[PDB]
Amino acid sequence: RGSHMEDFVRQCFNPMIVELAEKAMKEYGEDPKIETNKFAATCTHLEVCFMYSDGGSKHRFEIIEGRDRIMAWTVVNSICNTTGVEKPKFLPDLYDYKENRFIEIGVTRREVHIYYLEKANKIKSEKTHIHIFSFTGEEMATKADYTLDEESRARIKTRLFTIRQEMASRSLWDSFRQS
Amino acid sequence: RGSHMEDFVRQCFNPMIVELAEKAMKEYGEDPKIETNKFAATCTHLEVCFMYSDGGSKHRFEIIEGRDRIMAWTVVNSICNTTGVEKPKFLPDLYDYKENRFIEIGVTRREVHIYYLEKANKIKSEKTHIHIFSFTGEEMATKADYTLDEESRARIKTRLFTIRQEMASRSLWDSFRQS
Amino acid sequence: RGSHMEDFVRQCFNPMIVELAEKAMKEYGEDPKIETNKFAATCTHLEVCFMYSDGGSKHRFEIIEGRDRIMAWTVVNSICNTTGVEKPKFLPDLYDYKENRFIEIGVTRREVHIYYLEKANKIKSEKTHIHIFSFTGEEMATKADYTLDEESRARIKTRLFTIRQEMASRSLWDSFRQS
Amino acid sequence: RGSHMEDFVRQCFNPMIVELAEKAMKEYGEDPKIETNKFAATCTHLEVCFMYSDGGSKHRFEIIEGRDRIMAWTVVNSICNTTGVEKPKFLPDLYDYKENRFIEIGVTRREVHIYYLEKANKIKSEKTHIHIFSFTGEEMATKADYTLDEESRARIKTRLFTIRQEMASRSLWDSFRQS
Amino acid sequence: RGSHMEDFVRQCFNPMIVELAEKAMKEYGEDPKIETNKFAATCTHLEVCFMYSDGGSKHRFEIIEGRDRIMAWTVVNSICNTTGVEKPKFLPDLYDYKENRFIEIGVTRREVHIYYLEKANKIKSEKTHIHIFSFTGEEMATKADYTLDEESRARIKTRLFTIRQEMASRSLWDSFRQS
Amino acid sequence: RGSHMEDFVRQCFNPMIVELAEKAMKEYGEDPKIETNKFAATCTHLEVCFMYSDGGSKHRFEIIEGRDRIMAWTVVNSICNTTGVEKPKFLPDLYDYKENRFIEIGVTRREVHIYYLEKANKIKSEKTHIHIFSFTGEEMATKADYTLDEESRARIKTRLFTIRQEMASRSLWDSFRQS
Amino acid sequence: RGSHMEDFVRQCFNPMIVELAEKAMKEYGEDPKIETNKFAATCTHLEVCFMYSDGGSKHRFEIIEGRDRIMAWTVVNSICNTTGVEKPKFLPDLYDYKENRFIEIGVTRREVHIYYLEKANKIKSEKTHIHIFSFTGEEMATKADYTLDEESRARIKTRLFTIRQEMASRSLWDSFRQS
Amino acid sequence: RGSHMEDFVRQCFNPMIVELAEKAMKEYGEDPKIETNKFAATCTHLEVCFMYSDGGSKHRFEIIEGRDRIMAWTVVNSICNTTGVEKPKFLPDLYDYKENRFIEIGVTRREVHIYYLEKANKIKSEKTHIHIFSFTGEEMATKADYTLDEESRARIKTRLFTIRQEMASRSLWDSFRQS
């Protein structure tokens, strides 16, 4: 019940991302009070997706992650039925209105290119773009097309390494990298 | 009195657009509690006009729809008496400060090009631009000049199809497409 | 998915009570999109408990309903370990700091005194006070001790009958009284 | 169109009362831009009713005036079906939870006791309380039961005479007292 | 131009009282940048009047000080024409709705009873109550009727001595007590 | 005291511009309650200057109009002592950080080019730019350099003609054009 | 650096009390990141003092704790120089305007009566009231005069035991009770 | 204790910069009530750094100044470990995401080029950019690369000279230039 990682996650991310991660995890039958590593992972993924969507230019991205399952899908059908893009098999995170493709955002604790592989065998859809970030500071995207400019992606890497430092300062990073 | 479409409209659009649609419909002698399809249509038209005006660049559009009749006209006379453009016969929805022309925004449930025809015989003014959106996801504008960029108009189409899905999920879309 | 009762509940109660009812129902494995009658019941119970706690005088009641299970219990242990009152078997709704007893608030669709019976066999604790409200406008409390004054309890009855009227106007009240 | 009374009413009362008076007058087919005296009268009546309801003690009054017709009635049926009081023939302004009776609030430009007469022949219901205020500073209530204390009713009289002074300073009071 | 007392007054009182004192002093042809002692005196008088009006019970006092001359008078005529109290010769600060009399609030740097004398020869009206506060911590009122309870008047004295300490800490109190 | 123009000005412009105009007029010994035409003129000039400063790009203009005399000057000395531009003889309205020159904004009721003449004989400084707007919808600037783009200046003309229409609807425009 | 108690304190108390405790501890040369037990103690003491001051009736208490040393003293001199009460030797927490005495509030982890002893030998002033609360749920005050009513003091005890439970759930309570 | 410079600093800068300067000075063992010149210097440096960071384009700069020492460093390690830039020896003020270098911002009272020298011997790191501003209105940066455009840096110079004027008007500038 009383885990250091829970209090650290509640002290690290803003209340909105914490509430959204709690909702998304309870929806799939996972307890934030027990799966604390998955709690931190969901919060980090949500914040990274939000910074990514903010890195655009007003009407650039459509936020899919953070919506309810029935609602997050409804936007996918509306995007597909209006542009003509094939419907993805699994829920993505964003839709680039400038590139006419969905974006899958990953945040891994291992090296940058095995998580892309893991996300590539699962997807195997079509034009769905994959963008991977790592806590080490590296990144990797489809066709080397990193979608955003260098200044926006640098902020995501900096914030990612900031969370890694705060976890290690509380001896919680070693258990985070395992699972 | 107790109609599903009324509660759906109050749950779908934000309170400001709902209040503006109620005002605009009561002004013309129409009850939102009875003409629920017209209520949803007015709300959708208002939201589409607002997204259109937001798709500009700060000082780009002058919002005519959503103003009171005497006030909405007063801005039309001020626009005409300062630029020299001929006064339109019927109230438009916007004025493009970059193109020196008024814009008429339509949202139809039929195919995109019969509503443009219907709006073309009524207008027949001069340089008044016509821009039509459909729930199917298509669009059509005067001289193929769609005024806004592709990214802004895609958001309008996506949101339009989102409302169509929520209506069909409540079995209210079939009655909406009829009237 | 698209139920009239869902939109009516979202249009009737404020967003905070709706969110709290969604949380409380998802916690116990119940879907607000499917168990719409239970959704309305949870919202009504929450609002009645809140009006009851507001009917006091600043430092009068301690709100138990609407808190998370682990948190709502933690306040019960703190109340018991500081006053000396025996710990209740099941989660109550309030604690009267003026009467040194917990309060169980019920809102039933049947007559007022069978729900009290149903709540009396389940409880059978000790000094836990029971207060029952009905949609018909009647009420019943332990030892005829209605805790609050007449003016506060009249507001709860009035609001309860207001919800019953809005449900019947949408033909949703008959299905509500059944389950 | 451009009437001094309209601008004075918009400068005198707060925007909420002005909007509520506009809604209530448009509901009954009356134009605030044309019936400016009736506009000021509706605004004054609304503000007096609000100060009256504020003169209570938290859970004392139920505000009927300012609600929509279908909604304002729904609260009357809920009050009657829960307390047992006979349903009034015409819409009142408040309900005293402490006295178990409805209150009719009048604000007249003539002497205090002819408007009470006018309101007494129309009503003739039962326990519906009548409370009359005048711009001259006098008042009159049923059974000499003025419901509120002296300090609250003095504020209403003071504010009423303040509006009369501002009208006379703009030469609008003489036309107000006629109609 | 650059006076220590000006910056101290802007750092001591809240922006609203500072703005009201600036307005009241510019209305009578006095510069806050030059008459800095009168600036501090006006701010202190305004704050004392506000704490006094707050010391009541909701509908107790009518605030006269801090209003514009034409507006502050208009409330005096409305109070007199509705209660029957004789109109005062000079603008007072409050009106006690519970005692049916106006209140004149003074804040002096000399002893408490010479300022009352000075305010008594000027007034000499009728039932206008006089209440005097001093920076030394003493007070004096008409007929020993101090209107408010002991707890509210103690706060005013405490705050008054707090300002005297902050002035002396900046060597500005000696010049304040002179003028 | 009770002038139609006063209530119209309070109903037309936002409270901030009204307060700033009241301050600026009381500073120079002019009463807004008496010099109502000058009141409307000051409000219009302030709003036009604000729209002009907003027409830039974040760090483009430095707002001089609307500041207190001693403060509005202090910014002029700071601008001159840091850029090297000669100090103007009379207070301007803006400073263009992109053009290294002050801007004088005029709003006249006569034709556009006699007010520029009137403002040119008074100024006769150096690089101080003059920009004139008229209620008729025309404009005129130094060296035909209109500083802003066409879309921003069109909004100012439209709003100017909107105020002219509202004045004429209340029969206040004829007296406005005289003085 | 990374202590569980720090994150727990930041997750438990509101940001204002946390900031005030950080300020008060840095003022006396103590690090909240190192003296985490003292951090939690300062936060708990501040919250208890705030609930105590809120337990009064508007103008009842004067808050001394939470102010800066020079400021917190300045209010003590102002209270003494206006009421005549002897100046205390050490900074208290409140001043009861109804009882004409200062209040010292203690929150101990041991039994209730040894901390009162410890606070009695240190004080030994005069009429300075001592009120002690414990995490076990007991209390003790001077002359058995508990100042507040039973309902307000019960809330403090309940909240105190809530913090003790959350500490023990994170295995931080055992180290808290030691120091 | 009562210094003119303290009140001037509290009247000049916004409360946030004042609080941040108080925190930063108390962290290094310096009293704002005593080291008033250093207080004004810290406030000016903070405001200049904030205007500099605002002069960018959304995701351009990372604010280092104004953060706590342990936190301000944590961002430096995250920036270095993600971009590959060498870690600076002393805490900088910003990081330019567009130029891949840290920025050191200085505000001196002497001539612009001796403070750059003083900051150059201390630094002597690598690609750390130095940008110096002066109260006289001049500036100097590394490689004549002033990072921002001319319009943003002109605002900083103007505001700097505004503070110098307000200090001299209160006879506080001469003592400021000495230390």
Ligand SMILES: COc1cc(CCNC(=O)c2nc(-c3ccccc3)[nH]c(=O)c2O)ccc1O
């Ligand atoms: C059961 O897990 C969840 C599943 C979902 C549905 C959609 N899922 C994602 O969008 C997603 N989710 C993770 C990720 C990885 C590890 C732990 C937690 C989340 N990584 C990603 O790259 C990614 O696109 C939402 C929230 C969840 O918690």
Ligand SMILES: COc1cc(CCNC(=O)c2nc(-c3ccccc3)[nH]c(=O)c2O)ccc1O
């Ligand atoms: C009586 O109807 C209304 C009329 C008006 C006046 C101006 N009208 C429009 O601006 C408009 N209105 C619809 C439309 C179509 C069907 C139903 C409702 C609205 N479509 C459009 O393209 C369009 O330009 C305002 C609100 C109304 O409700």
Ligand SMILES: COc1cc(CCNC(=O)c2nc(-c3ccccc3)[nH]c(=O)c2O)ccc1O
């Ligand atoms: C006494 O008058 C005022 C003077 C001032 C000082 C600076 N003045 C202007 O900045 C200004 N003022 C008007 C103008 C013209 C007619 C009536 C009112 C204002 N026109 C302009 O073009 C213009 O630059 C400020 C506010 C005033 O009211």
Ligand SMILES: COc1cc(CCNC(=O)c2nc(-c3ccccc3)[nH]c(=O)c2O)ccc1O
């Ligand atoms: C150095 O310590 C502090 C001292 C001060 C000055 C005034 N002190 C109190 O007002 C106080 N302080 C604690 C207490 C006990 C243990 C740890 C922390 C605080 N207990 C009490 O009963 C109590 O009246 C303010 C904040 C501090 O952190």
Ligand SMILES: COc1cc(CCNC(=O)c2nc(-c3ccccc3)[nH]c(=O)c2O)ccc1O
């Ligand atoms: C002890 O002093 C402080 C030191 C610090 C740590 C980082 N320091 C700066 O970032 C900094 N500080 C000054 C400066 C110069 C004179 C007086 C005050 C500050 N000038 C600069 O250019 C500059 O980069 C933060 C706040 C301080 O008060």
Ligand SMILES: [Mn+2]
């Ligand atoms: Mn996803």
Ligand SMILES: [Mn+2]
């Ligand atoms: Mn993803």
Ligand SMILES: [Mn+2]
């Ligand atoms: Mn239209």
Ligand SMILES: [Mn+2]
């Ligand atoms: Mn249209």
Ligand SMILES: [Mn+2]
């Ligand atoms: Mn219950």
Ligand SMILES: [Mn+2]
């Ligand atoms: Mn009435």
Ligand SMILES: [Mn+2]
């Ligand atoms: Mn006085």
Ligand SMILES: [Mn+2]
């Ligand atoms: Mn000017």
Ligand SMILES: [Mn+2]
């Ligand atoms: Mn000008």
Ligand SMILES: [Mn+2]
């Ligand atoms: Mn204490």
Ligand SMILES: [Mn+2]
């Ligand atoms: Mn620095």
